[PDB]
Short mmCIF file of N, CA and C in Angstrom, two decimals:
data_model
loop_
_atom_site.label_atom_id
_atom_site.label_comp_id
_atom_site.label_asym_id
_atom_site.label_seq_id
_atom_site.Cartn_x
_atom_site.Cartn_y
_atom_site.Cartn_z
N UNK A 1 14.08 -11.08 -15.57
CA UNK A 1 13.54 -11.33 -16.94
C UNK A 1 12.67 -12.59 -16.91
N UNK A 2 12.89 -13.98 -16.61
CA UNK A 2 12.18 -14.66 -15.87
C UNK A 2 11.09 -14.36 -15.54
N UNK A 3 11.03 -13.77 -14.25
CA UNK A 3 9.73 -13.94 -13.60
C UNK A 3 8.99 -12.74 -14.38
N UNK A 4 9.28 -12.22 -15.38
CA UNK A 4 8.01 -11.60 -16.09
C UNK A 4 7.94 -12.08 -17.49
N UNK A 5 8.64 -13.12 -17.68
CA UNK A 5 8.29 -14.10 -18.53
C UNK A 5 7.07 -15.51 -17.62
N UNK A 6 7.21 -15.86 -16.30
CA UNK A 6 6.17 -16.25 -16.27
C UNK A 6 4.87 -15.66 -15.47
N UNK A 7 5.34 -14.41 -15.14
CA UNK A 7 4.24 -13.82 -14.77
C UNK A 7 3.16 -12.98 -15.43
N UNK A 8 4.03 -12.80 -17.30
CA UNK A 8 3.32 -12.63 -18.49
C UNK A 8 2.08 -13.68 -18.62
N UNK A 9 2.84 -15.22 -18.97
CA UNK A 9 2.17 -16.04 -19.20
C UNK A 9 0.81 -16.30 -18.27
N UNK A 10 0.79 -15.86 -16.72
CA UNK A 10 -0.47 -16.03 -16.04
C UNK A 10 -1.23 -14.71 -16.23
N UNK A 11 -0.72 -13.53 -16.34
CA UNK A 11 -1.07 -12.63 -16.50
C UNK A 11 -1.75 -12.16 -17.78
N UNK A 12 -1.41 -12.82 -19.07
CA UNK A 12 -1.73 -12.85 -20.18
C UNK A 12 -3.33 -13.13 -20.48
N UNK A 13 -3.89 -14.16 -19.93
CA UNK A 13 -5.56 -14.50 -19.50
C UNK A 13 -6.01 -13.69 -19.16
N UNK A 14 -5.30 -12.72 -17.76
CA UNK A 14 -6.21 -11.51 -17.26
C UNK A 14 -6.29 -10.49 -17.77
N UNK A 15 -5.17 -10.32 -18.66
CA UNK A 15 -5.73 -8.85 -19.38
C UNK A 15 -5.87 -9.25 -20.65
N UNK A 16 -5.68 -9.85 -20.91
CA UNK A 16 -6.54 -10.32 -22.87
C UNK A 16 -8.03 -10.47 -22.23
N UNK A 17 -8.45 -11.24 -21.10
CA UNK A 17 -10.40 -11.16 -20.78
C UNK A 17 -10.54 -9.79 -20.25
N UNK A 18 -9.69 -8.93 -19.84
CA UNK A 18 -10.09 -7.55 -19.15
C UNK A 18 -9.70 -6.64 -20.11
N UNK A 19 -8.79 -6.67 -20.77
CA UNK A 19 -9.15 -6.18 -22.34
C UNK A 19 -9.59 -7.11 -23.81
N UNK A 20 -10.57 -7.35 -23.84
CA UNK A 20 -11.59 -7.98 -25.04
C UNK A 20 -11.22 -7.31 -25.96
N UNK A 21 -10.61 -8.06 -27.12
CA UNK A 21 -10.57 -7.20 -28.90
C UNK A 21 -9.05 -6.70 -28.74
N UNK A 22 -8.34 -7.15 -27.74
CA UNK A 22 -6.54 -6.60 -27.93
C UNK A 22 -5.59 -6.88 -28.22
N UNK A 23 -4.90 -6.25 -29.00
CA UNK A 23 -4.02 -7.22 -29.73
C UNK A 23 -2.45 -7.66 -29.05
N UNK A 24 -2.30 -8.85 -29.65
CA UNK A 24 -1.22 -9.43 -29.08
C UNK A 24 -0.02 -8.40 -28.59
N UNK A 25 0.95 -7.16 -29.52
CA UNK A 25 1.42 -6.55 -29.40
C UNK A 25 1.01 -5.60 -28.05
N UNK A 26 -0.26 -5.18 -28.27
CA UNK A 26 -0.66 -4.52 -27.28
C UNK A 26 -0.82 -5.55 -26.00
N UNK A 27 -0.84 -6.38 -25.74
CA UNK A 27 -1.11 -7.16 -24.50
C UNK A 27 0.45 -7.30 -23.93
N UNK A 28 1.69 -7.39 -24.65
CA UNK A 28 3.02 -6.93 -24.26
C UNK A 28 3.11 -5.66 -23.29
N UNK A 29 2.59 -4.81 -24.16
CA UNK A 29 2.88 -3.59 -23.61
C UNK A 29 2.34 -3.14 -22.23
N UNK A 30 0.62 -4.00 -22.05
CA UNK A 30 -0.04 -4.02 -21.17
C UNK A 30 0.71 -4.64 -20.15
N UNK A 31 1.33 -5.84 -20.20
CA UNK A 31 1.85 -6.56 -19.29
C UNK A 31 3.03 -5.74 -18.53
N UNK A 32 3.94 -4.98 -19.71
CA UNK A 32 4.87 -4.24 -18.86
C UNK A 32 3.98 -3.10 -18.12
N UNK A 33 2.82 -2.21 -18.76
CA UNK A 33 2.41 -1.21 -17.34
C UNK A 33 1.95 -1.87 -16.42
N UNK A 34 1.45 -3.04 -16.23
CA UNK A 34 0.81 -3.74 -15.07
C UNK A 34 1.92 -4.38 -14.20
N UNK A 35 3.41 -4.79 -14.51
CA UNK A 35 4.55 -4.72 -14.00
C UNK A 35 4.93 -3.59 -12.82
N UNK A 36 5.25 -2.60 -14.20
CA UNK A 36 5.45 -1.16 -13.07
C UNK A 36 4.77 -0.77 -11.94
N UNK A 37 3.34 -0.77 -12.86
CA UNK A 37 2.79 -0.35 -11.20
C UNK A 37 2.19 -1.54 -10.03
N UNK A 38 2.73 -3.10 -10.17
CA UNK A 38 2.64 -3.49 -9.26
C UNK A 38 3.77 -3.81 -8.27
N UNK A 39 3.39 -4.20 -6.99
CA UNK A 39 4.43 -3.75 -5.92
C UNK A 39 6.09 -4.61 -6.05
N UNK A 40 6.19 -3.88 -5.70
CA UNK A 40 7.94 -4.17 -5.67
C UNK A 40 8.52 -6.05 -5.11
N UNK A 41 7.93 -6.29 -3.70
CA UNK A 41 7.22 -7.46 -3.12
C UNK A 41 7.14 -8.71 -4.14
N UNK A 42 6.36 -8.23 -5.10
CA UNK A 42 5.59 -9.12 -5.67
C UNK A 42 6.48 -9.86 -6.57
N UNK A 43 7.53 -8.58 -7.48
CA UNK A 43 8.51 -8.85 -7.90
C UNK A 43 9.27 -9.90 -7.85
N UNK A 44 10.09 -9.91 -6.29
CA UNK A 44 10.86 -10.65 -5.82
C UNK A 44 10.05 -12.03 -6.05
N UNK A 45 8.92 -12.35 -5.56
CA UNK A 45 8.77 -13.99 -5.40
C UNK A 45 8.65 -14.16 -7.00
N UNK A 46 8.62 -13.54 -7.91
CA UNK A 46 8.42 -14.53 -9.21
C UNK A 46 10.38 -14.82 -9.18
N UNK A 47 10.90 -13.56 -9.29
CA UNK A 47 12.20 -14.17 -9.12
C UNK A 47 12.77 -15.10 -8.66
N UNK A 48 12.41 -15.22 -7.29
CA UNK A 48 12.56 -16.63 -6.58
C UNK A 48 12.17 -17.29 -6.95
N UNK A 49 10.79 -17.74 -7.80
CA UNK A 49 10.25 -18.72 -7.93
C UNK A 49 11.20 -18.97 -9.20
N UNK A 50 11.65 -18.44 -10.07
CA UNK A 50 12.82 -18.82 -11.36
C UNK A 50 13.71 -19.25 -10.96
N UNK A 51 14.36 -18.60 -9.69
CA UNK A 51 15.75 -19.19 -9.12
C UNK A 51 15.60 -20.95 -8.71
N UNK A 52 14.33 -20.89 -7.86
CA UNK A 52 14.38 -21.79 -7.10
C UNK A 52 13.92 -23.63 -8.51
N UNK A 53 13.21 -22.53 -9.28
CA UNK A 53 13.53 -23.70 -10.81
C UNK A 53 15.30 -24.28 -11.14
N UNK A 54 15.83 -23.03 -11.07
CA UNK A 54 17.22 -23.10 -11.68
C UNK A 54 17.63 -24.36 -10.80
N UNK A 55 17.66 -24.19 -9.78
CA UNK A 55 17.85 -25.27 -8.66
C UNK A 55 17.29 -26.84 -9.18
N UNK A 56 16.15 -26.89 -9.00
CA UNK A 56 15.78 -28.10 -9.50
C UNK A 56 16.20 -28.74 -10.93
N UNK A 57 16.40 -27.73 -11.85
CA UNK A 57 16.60 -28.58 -13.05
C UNK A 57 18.11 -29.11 -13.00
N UNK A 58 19.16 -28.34 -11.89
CA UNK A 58 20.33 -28.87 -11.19
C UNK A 58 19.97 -30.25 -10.92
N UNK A 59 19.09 -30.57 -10.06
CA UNK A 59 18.74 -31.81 -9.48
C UNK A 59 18.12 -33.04 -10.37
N UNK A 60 17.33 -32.47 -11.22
CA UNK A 60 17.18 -33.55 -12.65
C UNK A 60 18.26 -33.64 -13.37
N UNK A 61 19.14 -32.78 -13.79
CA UNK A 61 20.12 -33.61 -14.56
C UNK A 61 21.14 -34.52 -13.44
N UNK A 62 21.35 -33.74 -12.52
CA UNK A 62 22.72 -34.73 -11.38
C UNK A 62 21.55 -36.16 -11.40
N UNK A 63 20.82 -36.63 -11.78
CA UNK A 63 20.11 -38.27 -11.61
C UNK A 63 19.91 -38.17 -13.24
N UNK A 64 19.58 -37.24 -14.10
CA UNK A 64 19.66 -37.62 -15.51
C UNK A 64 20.95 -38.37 -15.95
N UNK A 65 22.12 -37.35 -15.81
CA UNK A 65 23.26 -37.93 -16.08
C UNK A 65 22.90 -38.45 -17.49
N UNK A 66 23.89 -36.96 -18.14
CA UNK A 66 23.55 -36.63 -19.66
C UNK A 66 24.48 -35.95 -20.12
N UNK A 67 24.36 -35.29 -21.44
CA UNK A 67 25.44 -34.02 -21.95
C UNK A 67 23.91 -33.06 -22.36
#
């Protein structure tokens, strides 16, 4: 869920300029067919790249030292 939350957000530029005049709703929907049919591969590293966040914000709070 993650990584197509930020792979929306980069992805969002390319198809709002590759579809001109589309609406927000519709640029959702776009984002999930451009999901599906891209490779499986590709998938995984946004995931990782969320996990490997989860990790770090571990590491800012253990030196934040907070509630």
């Amino acid at each position: 869920m993650s990584a197509y939350m930020l792979w929306l957000n980069a992805s969002r530029e390319k198809i709002k300029s590759d579809h001109p005049g589309i609406s927000i709703t519709d640029l959702s929907k776009k984002a999930g067919e451009i999901w599906k049919g891209m490779s499986k591969e590709k998938k995984e590293e946004w995931d990782r790249k969320a996990e490997d966040a989860r990790r770090d914000y571990e590491k800012a709070m253990k030196e934040y030292e907070g509630g």
